Design a protein around this ligand. Structure first.
Ligand SMILES: O=C1Nc2ccc(F)cc2C1=O
Length: 209
């Protein structure tokens, strides 16, 4: 059972802007996704302070970076609070309608694309490098779901039947054919050290066979 939804008009505009605007500093996508994971890990930690039973689905608060050259995917896994089905349909837990407005206003008022995270819509920077994005998420209060979109104005949501996650979010980036540099160990390391050296959770960069 696959449900197809249409993006809000403002969100579809944001995605086509990111896809079509000539902009060479694409590496900032990893900083935004890692920052989104750190925000989700902060949320589960804060709720765990007043209720330790919320960590029953997983006590480790970490971030893993998993490149795969065979599938040409870069996956960002975190054990954060996760997202419900309502969260997924509601623009992946963001206030994307108002955040897109302030972002597009700034883009004509001097700002550039690298400042996308300052308006809460940093997740969509994934389409700077990915032709398709798959999001697997598991919140304590809901089941495991799979969000997917190749842009084009629509996305799909389905119950995920694959490997159970416990709790957290998995962002799979199906990279464009000319963006395979972000599958290289030294390139990923350089970006993490440059843009995410002070993240308060362990970041493990997986290596390949
Ligand atoms: O990619 C990276 N992960 C890391 C974790 C710890 C650290 F000190 C550096 C790095 C990287 O560059």
């Amino acid at each position: 059972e696959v449900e197809t939804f249409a993006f809000q008009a403002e969100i579809a505009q944001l995605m086509s802007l990111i896809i079509n605007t000539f902009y060479s500093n694409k590496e900032i996508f990893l900083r935004e996704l890692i920052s989104n994971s750190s925000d989700a890990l902060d949320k589960i930690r804060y709720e765990s302070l007043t209720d330790p039973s919320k960590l029953d689905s997983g006590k480790e608060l970490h971030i893993n970076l998993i490149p795969n050259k065979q599938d040409r995917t870069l996956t960002i896994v975190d054990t954060g609070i996760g997202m419900t089905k309502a969260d997924l349909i509601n623009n992946l837990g963001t206030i994307a309608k108002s955040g897109t407005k302030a972002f597009m206003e700034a883009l004509q008022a001097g700002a550039d694309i690298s400042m996308i995270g300052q308006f809460g819509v940093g997740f969509y920077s994934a389409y700077l490098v990915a032709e398709k994005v798959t999001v697997i998420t598991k919140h304590n209060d809901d089941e495991q779901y799979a969000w997917e979109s190749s842009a084009g104005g629509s996305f799909t949501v389905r119950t995920d039947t694959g490997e159970p996650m416990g709790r957290g979010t998995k962002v799979i980036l199906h990279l464009k054919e000319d963006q395979t540099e972000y599958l290289e160990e030294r390139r990923i390391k350089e970006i993490v050290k440059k843009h995410s050296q002070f993240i308060g959770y362990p970041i493990t960069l997986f290596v390949e066979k």
